C-alpha cells in the first residue's frame, strides 16, 4: 500500500 498523505488545507 502507498504511503498516504492528507489533503493540504
Amino acid at each position, epitope marked *: *500500500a*502507498p*504511503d*498516504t*498523505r*492528507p*489533503a*493540504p*488545507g
Partner: antibody
Amino acid sequence: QVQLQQSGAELVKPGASVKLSCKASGYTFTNYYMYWVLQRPGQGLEWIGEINPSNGGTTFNEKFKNKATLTVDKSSSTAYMQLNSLTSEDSAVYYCTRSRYGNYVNYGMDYWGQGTSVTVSS
Amino acid sequence: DIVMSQSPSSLAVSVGEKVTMSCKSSQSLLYSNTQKNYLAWYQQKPGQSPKLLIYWASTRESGVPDRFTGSGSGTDFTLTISSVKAENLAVYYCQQYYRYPPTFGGGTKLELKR
C-alpha cells in the same frame, strides 16, 4: 501565472548556515505540498523533504534529518529551507517545487523554482 | 528507499527516430486492483529546472505533446518519444511516489547521432 521565485545564489564557509527562500504566486499556497529537491554538480535529483504550508508540518529524507529545516510564512506565501553545518558535499542547486495532490499522494512536481546555487568552500 | 534504475544512461538518436528509454523499480509501484502506477517522468535540459511530462506512469501533463508516451506496470516502465525533435534532447528522469522518500532514477541523456 504560477511562479516560484527562489532567492539569490549563495557562497559560504564550511560550518555556516544558509536560509533559502521560495516566494510562491499565482495559486493558493496552502493547497499544495511544497517539496525541496537538490542537484549536486553534474548529478541526478534527490528529494530533501516536504512541508504542508497550511499547518507547517514536515517530513525529511533520512539523509537530511539534521541538515535541513523547513518553514513557511503564510501571509507572504514563502517557503524557507535552512541548511546547517554546511560541508562542501552540500554544494549544489537547491529547488523548491509544487506537488499536485490526488489519490492520497503527491503525484507530480509541476512547477519548479529556477533553483538556488549554494557553494561551500573555505 | 525504492531504487529506480534507468537504462541506458546515454542514448544517441536521429531527428525523426522513435526512441524508448527504460525505468525499472525495486518494488512494485502498482497499487492493488486500482490499475494506478505511482510513477512520473521529468525532462531536464541543461541550465534549466526539471519539467514534469508524465504522471501515473502514462498520463501526460497538460501542454506536453502526445509524441511522449509513458507505459508499463509494476516494476518495468518505459518512456517513448515517437518522433524525436532537436528540442527533445535532454536528460529524462523517472520518479516513484509510492513510498517516502520519493526517489528518482539516474537519468537517461539523449544526444544526437552523427
